[PDB]
Amino acid sequence: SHMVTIVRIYLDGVYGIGKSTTGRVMASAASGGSPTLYFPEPMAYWRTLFETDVISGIYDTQNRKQQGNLAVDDAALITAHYQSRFTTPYLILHDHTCTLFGGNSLQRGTQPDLTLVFDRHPVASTVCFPAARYLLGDMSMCALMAMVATLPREPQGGNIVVTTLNVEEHIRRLRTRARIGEQIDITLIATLRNVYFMLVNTCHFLRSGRVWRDGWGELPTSCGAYKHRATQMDAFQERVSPELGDTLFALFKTQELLDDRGVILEVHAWALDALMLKLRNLNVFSADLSGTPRQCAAVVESLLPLMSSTLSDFDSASALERAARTFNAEMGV
Amino acid sequence: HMVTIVRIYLDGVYGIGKSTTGRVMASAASGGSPTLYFPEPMAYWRTLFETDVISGIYDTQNRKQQGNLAVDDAALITAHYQSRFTTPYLILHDHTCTLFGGNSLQRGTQPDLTLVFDRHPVASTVCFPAARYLLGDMSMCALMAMVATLPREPQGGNIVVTTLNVEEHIRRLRTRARIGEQIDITLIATLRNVYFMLVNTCHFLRSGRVWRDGWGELPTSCGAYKHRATQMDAFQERVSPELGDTLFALFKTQELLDDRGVILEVHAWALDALMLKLRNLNVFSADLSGTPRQCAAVVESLLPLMSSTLSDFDSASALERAARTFNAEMG
Ligand SMILES: Cc1cn([C@H]2C[C@H](O)[C@@H](CO)O2)c(=O)[nH]c1=O
Ligand SMILES: Cc1cn([C@H]2C[C@H](O)[C@@H](CO)O2)c(=O)[nH]c1=O
């Protein structure tokens, strides 16, 4: 009933950069600042709650394909389904929490009563990782469209912080984390890194008032060469003034989505319209994570004066605290 | 200068005559006030991409029921095809949802504009997935993944679930064009039960009850439950349903409970979401045992009972364009 000001932050980016550790420090009292709740990756939902481990499954699918115990056509389909299952616990969490944030989104500049830090936004599993998989040829455009369509609309007041890190230190971090001689999917990481820069650029692009049709006619179709560039290490970066070719929209200009005359079908244009509207309420930032976890938390926290806050109330904030405790407990190990 | 809109989602098991009814309703030959029809997105499912999902989901069961494909793999691939059914619905729903307007009310009048949607997103995100789960073609994990993608219906929705006696249903299924679709009676029986569960869920919610109401007392829905749900006429429309008569009952399974037998909070959230998303669907059923003209008349008799919203002229014009576009690209 009593009013509460909330900043919510979705910390996102490529696996292995130090996002989860940063988020945990933010939530720790030792980092000071605002009282903060942290919602971890839904690890148990992915790995232990059901019969199948989707993380093992998605990586194992590609191995079964390369050796030849599973056909390429079948593998593409199984990969898409695994990618679908990644999104589930994010969609559930989003549906539960979006009722509690309240409205009256504004950039207030002041310190909130409390901060929420979500480990990833639903865009990670519905858009970024599917896009990476599509660009690498592990699943089709059809499958991509199917995941992208399931991106939920962000209500007013969202902030997304995309984590960045020089690639040498990124791979170092993955290396220390990995077992004795464990390989790292460098090609996947290179692509995901570009996809997250595309995401950042997309949000910047929309905030400048531009739309996916702006520069669409003039854009080259995104066939073999676009895909090579998209998997190329450091090919994309955060742009000051991004144009269409720097954003997620560019990959959708492929023959698969055009009529004979090369015009996008209207149904596909509607999908891009939906994608555009769903991302509108995301106030976008980027954060370098080269420092210590304490330093990383401070870098993110120092963004709060530029972030959107909403006005919730004590009962809803209390429900969010209960939600965080429940999600931390149930999603553990 | 408001435009009064009544939107109808005609839904139910395939083969019952729903699309024919919808076309008749929108046909100028049937007169009335201006009516638009949005067909099943057949081209999206069948021809727009390299794979046809209707033959693909059937073919998958065939490979399973033979050499080609292992049952674990078939279950994942079947879930993927089921996801692909939802896509054009999600896209259409995202495009039209802001156009309907607010001020949902049962006004009892003829609307300025009637919209007939062939199926609601619930069909592909919940009903067909649930049938596949109950039949053992998909896991509960796979079902949860589809169910979580159901979009929230904004105020003013009406759903008309079509009904038909088993004998006429079987007769009509035999009339259908050959498109490589699965057409067995155990599937039909299950879909009919699941659509009764859906109607009952809507009645249950409108009665002022929530899924926890009767949850504790409800038997755990494991192997026996699944068998019952595949039995022709195991379920029916009840305007005063028990929890066991709704879609909620199939979620009280071991897979979703802790060791103490209490549903996990995360799964409880998924039921809350389902409950909330169905809130704005005013539910009706219509028997389609008449002729195409008779069927349309039965559905039209429901209009004065339905919710209408108030939209502006530009929004209505855009809905008019959207039906034109959709018919053009989906056929
Ligand atoms: C969020 C997400 C993670 N992952 C993988 C990357 C990591 O190996 C692991 C945890 O982030 O899951 C996906 O493959 N797809 C996804 O959508
Ligand atoms: C909407 C829908 C239809 N179908 C099938 C039933 C019919 O064979 C055909 C057309 O409705 O597609 C599904 O298998 N899943 C779905 O979600």
- CA A204, CA A184: separation in Å to the nearest integer? 31
CA distances from residue A209 to A213, A277, B21, B77 in whole angstroms, order as listed: 12, 12, 44, 40
Q: Which residues of B touch A331 (CB under 8 A)?
A: 266
Complete DSSP assignment for B10-45: EE-STTSSHHHHHHHHH-GGG-SS-EEEE---HHHH
CA angle B269, B270, B271 (to 5 degrees): 90
A25 lines ligand 1 (CB under 6 A): no
Whether A158 and A308 have beta carbons less than 8 Å apart is answered as: yes
Distance from CA of B257 to the nearest CA of A (A): 10
Nearest to A286 by CA among A7, A8, A10, A5: A10
B105 φ/ψ angles, rounded to the nearest 5 degrees:
-155, 145
Distance from CA of B90 to the nearest CA of A (A): 6
Contacting A residues, span 159-218, partner chain B, CB-CB under 8 Å: none
CA distances from residue B24 to A147, B19, B328 in whole angstroms, order as listed: 34, 9, 18
Contact partners, residue B194, CB within 8 Å, separation at least 6: B127, B128, B130, B131, B134, B229, B247
Residue tagged 């081209």 (tokens): B43
Whether A296 and A144 have beta carbons less than 8 Å apart is answered as: no
Alpha carbon of residue A94 to chain centroid:
13
Whether B100 and B154 have beta carbons less than 8 Å apart is answered as: yes
Distance A14 CA to ligand 1 centre (A): 9
Three-state secondary structure call for residue B220: coil
- Stretch (H or E) spanning B157: strand B157-163
Three-state secondary structure call for residue B51: coil
Determine the residue type at A65: K
B99 φ/ψ angles, rounded to the nearest 5 degrees:
-85, -20
Contact partners, residue B63, CB within 8 Å, separation at least 6: B69, B74
Pairing state of beta strands B2-11 and A309-313? unpaired
Burial class (CB in 10 A: 0-12, 13-18, 19+), B321: exposed
B78 lines ligand 2 (CB under 6 A): no
Complete DSSP assignment for B259-326: TTSPBPHHHHHHHHHHHHHHTTEEEEEEE--S-HHHHHHHHHTTGGGS-EEEEEHHHHHHHHHHHHHH
Eight-class DSSP state of B151: P
- CA A89, CA A80: separation in Å to the nearest integer? 16
Nearest to B151 by CA among B113, B111, B123: B123
A129 lines ligand 1 (CB under 6 A): yes
Q: Do A266 and B325 touch (CB under 8 A)?
A: yes
A134 lines ligand 1 (CB under 6 A): no
Nearest to B204 by CA among B176, B164, B243: B243
- CA A13, CA B12: separation in Å to the nearest integer? 42
Contact partners, residue A39, CB within 8 Å, separation at least 6: A93, A97, A116, A117, A118, A119, A323, A324, A327, A328
Rounded to a whole number of angstroms, the distance between the first and last alpha carbons of chain B is: 34
Contacting A residues, span 237-296, partner chain B, CB-CB under 8 Å: 256, 265-267, 270-271, 273-274, 277
Eight-class DSSP state of A258: B
Please give the residue of chain B at the shortest CA–CA distance from A42: B266
B37 lines ligand 2 (CB under 6 A): no
Buried b vs exposed e over B100-118: b needs ≥16 C-beta within 10 Å? bbeebeebeeebbbbbbbb
Buried b vs exposed e over A168-191: b needs ≥16 C-beta within 10 Å? eebeebbeeeeeeeeeeeeebbbb
Q: Tokens for A200? A: 């950042």
Three-state secondary structure call for residue A134: helix
Q: Tokens for A147? A: 């995941």
Contacting B residues, span 29-88, partner chain A, CB-CB under 8 Å: 41, 44, 48-51, 69, 73, 76-77, 79-81, 83-84, 86-88
Q: Is CATH 3.40.50.300 the classification given to domain A1-333?
A: yes
Breaks in chain A, named by the residue before each, with C–N above 2.5 Å?
none
Pairing state of beta strands B281-287 and B157-163? parallel
- CA A149, CA A126: separation in Å to the nearest integer? 8
Distance from CA of B109 to the nearest CA of A (A): 32
Whether B187 and B168 have beta carbons less than 8 Å apart is answered as: no
Eight-class DSSP state of A33: S
Nearest to A5 by CA among A317, A321, A329, A323: A317
* Count of positions (residues) in chain B: 331
Whether B115 and A291 have beta carbons less than 8 Å apart is answered as: no
Whether B41 and B88 have beta carbons less than 8 Å apart is answered as: yes
* E strands in chain A: 3-12, 36-39, 103-106, 114-119, 158-164, 282-288, 309-313
Nearest to A206 by CA among A135, A275, A136: A275
CA distances from residue A146 to A11, A130, A201, A258 in whole angstroms, order as listed: 24, 10, 23, 17
- CA A233, CA B128: separation in Å to the nearest integer? 42
- CA A220, CA A189: separation in Å to the nearest integer? 25
Q: Tokens for A65? A: 């394909």
Distance B299 CA to ligand 2 centre (A): 22
CA angle B83, B88, B92 (to 5 degrees): 135
Three-state secondary structure call for residue A326: helix
- CA B326, CA B319: separation in Å to the nearest integer? 10
B320 lines ligand 2 (CB under 6 A): no
Q: Domain B1-331 is of which CATH architecture?
A: 3-Layer(aba) Sandwich (3.40)
Distance from CA of A182 to the nearest CA of B (A): 27
**Ligand 1, atom 11: nearest CA belongs to which residue?**
A15
CB atoms within 10 A of CB B220: 12
Please give the residue of chain B at the shortest CA–CA distance from A278: B94
Alpha carbon of residue A74 to chain centroid:
26
B286 φ/ψ angles, rounded to the nearest 5 degrees:
-140, 125
| Domain boundaries, given as residue ranges, for chain B | 1-331
Residue from the list A50, A143, A267 with its beta carbon closest to the beta carbon of B88: A267
Residue tagged 């929108």 (tokens): B26
The technique is: X-ray
Sign of CA dihedral B196, B202, B205, B207: negative
- Catalytic amino acids of A? 41
Task: Using CA atoms of B75, B80, B83, B85 in order, give the dihedral in degrees to the nearest 10.
Answer: -100
Q: Do A88 and B145 touch (CB under 8 A)?
A: yes
Distance B254 CA to ligand 2 centre (A): 29
CA angle A51, A54, A59 (to 5 degrees): 130
